[PDB]
């Protein structure tokens, strides 16, 4: 069937960021996975039968599917070790599990609300969004990433939500963009990102 091999099974989404957040860590460890850009109205058959909760994405490896944005990219970082993506000290480790919770519950609602919100909210959210992302400017001077030398998962929660910057109508404004805009030159063109990006999500780059 689906898990009949030692291979994965990922009923990913071609636009939904859960796929694109997963695929970065999914491919950043150099593993042979299967991509299936599929829709909500009509995904593939296996994505609905063995998936009794029916989310996107959905990874299946010889025992059962694993559906979440967190449970997936955690299952891979704890089973495929090298290179590593999360620190060792449990003090500064779970806090690295905190920014991911202060983004999926802080900067996610500013994406859905701009997807189903009124005309002012789309800029109101873009108001609370664009300036707030400038309130985090001086961070990048100290650390080459989000307060961590190594490329860790807390950075992967940003770039897929920094790759949809103007795709939902956003552009920077103010003093100090050269610190963050120059920072985007350091993350947006990595092997973990370059080979991982979905071409459908690229055309909003020009």
């Amino acid at each position: 069937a689906a898990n009949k091999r030692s291979v994965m099974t990922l009923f990913s989404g071609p636009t939904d960021i859960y796929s694109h957040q997963v695929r970065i860590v999914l491919a950043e460890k150099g593993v042979s996975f299967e991509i299936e850009h599929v829709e909500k109205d009509n995904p593939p058959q296996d994505l609905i039968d063995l998936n009794p909760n029916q989310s996107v994405p959905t990874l299946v490896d010889r025992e059962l599917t694993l559906w979440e944005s967190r449970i997936i990219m955690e299952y891979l970082d704890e089973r495929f070790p090298h290179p590593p993506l999360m620190p060792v000290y449990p003090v500064a480790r779970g806090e690295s599990r905190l920014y991911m919770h202060r983004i999926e519950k802080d900067w996610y609602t500013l994406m859905n609300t701009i997807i189903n919100g009124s005309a002012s909210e789309a800029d109101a959210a873009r108001k609370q969004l664009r300036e707030e992302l400038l309130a985090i400017a001086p961070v990048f001077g100290q650390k080459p990433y989000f307060l961590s030398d190594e490329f860790s998962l807390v950075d992967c929660y940003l770039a897929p939500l920094l790759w949809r910057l103007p795709q939902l109508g956003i552009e920077f404004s103010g003093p100090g963009a050269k610190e963050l805009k120059g920072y985007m030159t350091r993350v947006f063109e990595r092997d973990s990102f370059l080979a991982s990006l979905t071409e459908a999500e690229r055309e909003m780059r020009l």
Binding site: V88, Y89, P90, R93, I136, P138, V139
Partner: protein
Amino acid sequence: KDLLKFLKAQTKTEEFDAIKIALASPDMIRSWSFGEVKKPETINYRTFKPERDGLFCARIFGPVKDYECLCGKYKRLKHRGVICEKCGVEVTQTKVRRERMGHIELASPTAHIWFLKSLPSRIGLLLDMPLRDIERVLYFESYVVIEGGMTNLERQQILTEEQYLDALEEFGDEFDAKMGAEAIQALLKSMDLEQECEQLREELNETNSETKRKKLTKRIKLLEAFVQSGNKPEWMILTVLPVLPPDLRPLVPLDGGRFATSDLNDLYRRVINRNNRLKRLLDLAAPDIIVRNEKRMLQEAVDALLDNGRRGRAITGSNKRPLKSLADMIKGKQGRFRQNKRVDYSGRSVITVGPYLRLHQCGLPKKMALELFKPFIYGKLELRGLATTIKAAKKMVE
């Protein structure tokens, strides 16, 4: 959201200014420490690993060997933040054994010998009390009243042993007389720096006396500091005395068997022992001739720790020189404890003449310059390819 902007700066107070200093409240001295040192013993005498809950602890001031628990159950590189369940050491660097603090929990208050015996007695002129009377109350020799009420007694009448005893037979309530160092923590605790602040802002005007209204404005200038500053009065009576970290008072082992202790482990053992006994007499319920002699004996050992010498000079045991307390470590050697410092890359030799030199050049022997400029020389021998690696340039200069 400056919070994430905060913690980046919160853990980054290297750009700063304005070193700020002020008194320390017992709810804060309890907030530097990581645990309550509660025994007098230091190490094990057989296997020199340090004991538990003693002065040189490892559950309190961190581990001993770098990145490794104490028992010997967590050495690997896998676990590097966990705290060992057997002996609750946190497996981190042994540098952190140098910047953690403990704290002892005193079983009875005790005056801070700086703010009690520095010549203008900051406990005195905050209460308008002659210093020869405060010191007659911190030895339990003479009662003092609190909250007189409607009787023939002020708030600070010094009832002697009899005058109170010739007073308490007439009243049992409306009247409260304490004694000892736990009294001055009651005079202060109920005094208010605003009622008697402005009320003295008038009493100075009536007073026409070139000596009275000259130091009268000295007291009211001290009351006027304990309000805007933010320091309550009763924080000058200690209740939890914090302990230095165990690498700024080392117990290093000499070569041969002997140890070379600092002179604080001879003084901390003398407070934790006397305090540890006074915890006991209040359970065995001894008469008030002994326990009343205990507090008087503890308070002489917390004030032999801060500034030892303003008393009987509690000379060292096993030797005949006075111990060296904390405030005898910052005090002047004619130069500051910190910087105003020895220095690497130096030398010295006998000067001679050499009258063939230009005005702007001095000789420098080959045997010296080859020793000051070593880390530069290592640069060339690995840059010109003459040495493959640095360990093979150290054997070409030797």
